[PDB]
Amino acid sequence: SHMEEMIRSLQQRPEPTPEEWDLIHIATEAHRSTNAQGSHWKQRRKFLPDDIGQSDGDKVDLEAFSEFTKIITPAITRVVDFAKKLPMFSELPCEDQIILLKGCCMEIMSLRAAVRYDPESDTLTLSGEMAVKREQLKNGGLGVVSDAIFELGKSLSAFNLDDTEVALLQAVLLMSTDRSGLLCVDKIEKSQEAYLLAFEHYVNHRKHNIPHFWPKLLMKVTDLRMIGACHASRFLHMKVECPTELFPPLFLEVFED
Numbered sequence: 221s222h223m224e225e226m227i228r229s230l231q232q233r234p235e236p237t238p239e240e241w242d243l244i245h246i247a248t249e250a251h252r253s254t255n256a257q258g259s260h261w262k263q264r265r266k267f268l269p270d271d272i273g274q275s276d277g278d279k280v281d282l283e284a285f286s287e288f289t290k291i292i293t294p295a296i297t298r299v300v301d302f303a304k305k306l307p308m309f310s311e312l313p314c315e316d317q318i319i320l321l322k323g324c325c326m327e328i329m330s331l332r333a334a335v336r337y338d339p340e341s342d343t344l345t346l347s348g349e350m351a352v353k354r355e356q357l358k359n360g361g362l363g364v365v366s367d368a369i370f371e372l373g374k375s376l377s378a379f380n381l382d383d384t385e386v387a388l389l390q391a392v393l394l395m396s397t398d399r400s401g402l403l404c405v406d407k408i409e410k411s412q413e414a415y416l417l418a419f420e421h422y423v424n425h426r427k428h429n430i431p432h433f434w435p436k437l438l439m440k441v442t443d444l445r446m447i448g449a450c451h452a453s454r455f456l457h458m459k460v461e462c463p464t465e466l467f468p469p470l471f472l473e474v475f476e477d
C-alpha cells in the first residue's frame with residue numbers, strides 16, 4: 221500500500237453515458253418488479269419455526285427440504301421473469317435462454333437471499349417471505365452452501381448495495397459465455413461487456429467510502445459462481461437422498477443433467 225491515496229485520487233472514475241443510463245434504468249426496473257416484496261420484506265416476514273431444521277454425517281432433513289421446495293418454483297420463476305425483461309436476452313434463441321438460466325439461476329437466487337441478510341437475527345430472508353437460520357438452510361439440503369450464502373450476506377452489509385447494483389450484478393451473472401452449448405456467443409459476450417462497463421460507471425457514480433470497492437465487488441462474482449457450482453453437487457446429493465415426489469417439475473428442469 222505505497223502511494224495508495226494518490227493512486228486513488230489519480231484514477232479516472234467516469235460516470236455512465238446516456239446510452240449506459242438506458243441499460244441501468246431497464247435492468248433496475250426488471251429487478252425491482254421481479255423482487256416483489258423487496259420494498260416491505262423486513263416488515264412482513266414469517267420466520268420458519270425453530271423445530272424445522274434443528275440440529276448419518278450428511279443426511280437431509282426432509283421436513284425442511286419440503287418447506288424450501290414449496291417456495292422454489294416461484295423463486296426460479298422470478299429469475300426467468302427478470303431475464304425476460306432485459307432486451308439482449310429475449311431476442312436470443314430458445315436453447316441459449318435455457319443454457320444461460322441453467323448456469324446462473326442459483327447464482328441470482330443466492331445473491332438475492334444474501335442482500336436480505338439481517339445482522340440482528342442472523343437470518344436470510346428467502347423470496348421476501350421466509351426468514352431462515354443457517355442451520356435450517358444447511359440441513360434442508362444446501363449443506364456447506366448455506367454457510368457460503370450466510371458468509372456472503374455478512375460481507376455484503378458493508379457494501380450498501382442498492383437495487384441497481386444488485387440488478388446489474390444479476391445481469392452480469394446471466395450473460396456469461398462460460399457455459400457450453402451456446403449458439404449466439406458473440407451477442408452474449410458483447411452484452412456482458414456492456415453491462416460490466418455500465419456497472420463500473422454506476423459504481424463510480426455512487427462513490428462508496430470503501431477502498432478498492434469495484435475490485436472487491438468483482439471478487440463476489442467468484443463467490444457466487446462457487447455457490448452455483450457447489451449447489452450442482454448438492455442437487456445430486458438431494459436427488460439421491462430425498463424422495464422424487466418432493467421435487468417440483470421446474471426445479472428438476474433447471475438443475476438436472
Ligand SMILES: CC(C)c1cc(Oc2c(Cl)cc(-n3nc(N)c(=O)[nH]c3=O)cc2Cl)n[nH]c1=O
Pocket residue numbers: 254255285288289291292294295296298299326328329330332333345346347348357360361362369
Ligand atoms: C434446499 C434447496 C431446496 C434449495 C434452497 C434454496 O433456497 C433459496 C430459495 Cl428457495 C429462494 C431464494 N431466492 N430466490 C429468488 N428468486 C429470490 O428473489 N429470492 C430468494 O431468496 C434463495 C435461496 Cl438460497 N435454493 N435452492 C435450493 O436448491
